[PDB]
Amino acid sequence: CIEFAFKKAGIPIVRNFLHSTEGVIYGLPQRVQRNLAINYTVKQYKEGKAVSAKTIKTLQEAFPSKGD
């Protein structure tokens, strides 16, 4: 379900599509596989305070959720 996934859990629509394709990413052609990729970095900006790398993109990494 797409509706209750967002109601009972803070799962955005995009994250839902990602988890949906997560099981078929290998089935889809490599053209789509390269598209389904999120890799960047987030820093709390002092001279050198924090450096966080966002690469999972499915769990509570890029699209946090209440359930996690």
Binding site: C1, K8, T21, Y26
Partner: protein, 134 residues
Amino acid sequence: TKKQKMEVTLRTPYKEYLANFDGFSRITAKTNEASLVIQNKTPASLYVLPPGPLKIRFTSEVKNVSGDFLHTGGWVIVHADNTCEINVMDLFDRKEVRADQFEKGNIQDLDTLAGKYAAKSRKSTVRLFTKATT
């Protein structure tokens, strides 16, 4: 005020398939509740299509497109000026499905309130895709 017979726009963040098309005669998709059919004179309304199949009829055959696709998820809007726009995360043909390649390391999931729905959707697509090939 009002628009011509109709215009459909199928766009993908990585490619544009139909900036504006009129030769099509009908469109059918599967929403969360049930399947719908968008054609000429369809009233204004919003829809959100899960990763299901999208079939569109063409009066004249269009090159490089088969008319039967499986989208990973998208938004649909039918404006007041008799115009519908389909925007999906990604699109591909059934012939490139490459079935039997599912569950190749991403079976593991986390036991949380969100992970429960997360797997719920993933399982739904597997059951859907298997039928989509037929």
